[PDB]
Amino acid sequence: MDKLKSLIKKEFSISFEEFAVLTYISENKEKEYYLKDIINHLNYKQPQVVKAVKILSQEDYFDKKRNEHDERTVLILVNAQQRKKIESLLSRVNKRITEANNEIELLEHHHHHH
């Protein structure tokens, strides 16, 4: 695994694909979303986005439901407590990404090996 991906996964119990799902959700801030539309926008593949959504639903970040007119389509819903939890997570991950870069820059500013 990548070092920053491993650092985020160890700290938050969720991988960078889940952070990308939550980032897209925050960039499109609403009470409701379509899983089909999230799959179309994200760079990750359909089953990767499904696994990230599955993990985030199991971790209670949002609620999954079937569409009532055509059950092939799936929605994702965000309650007021979930909205605050998503902003809190995204800010803490951004803080850890920043601090990880600050440690890398400090290690490169420090003396190198012979």
Domain that holds residue 54: 3-109
* Contacts (Cβ under 8 Å, ≥6 apart) of 65: 74, 75, 76, 77
Angle 59-97-75 from CA coordinates, rounded to 5° = 35
For residue 114, tell me if it sits in a domain: no
Q: Is 90 exposed, middle or buried (0-12, 13-18, 19+ CB in 10 A)?
A: middle
- Bridge partner residues of 63 (DSSP): 77
Tokens (6 digits) for 76: 């994702």
Total domains in the chain come to 1
For residue 15, tell me if it sits in a domain: yes
- Bridge partner residues of 75 (DSSP): 34, 65
* Contacts (Cβ under 8 Å, ≥6 apart) of 55: 14, 15, 18
Domain containing residue 70: CATH number: 1.10.10.10
Residue of 104, 81, 89, 75 whose CA lies nearest to 2:
104
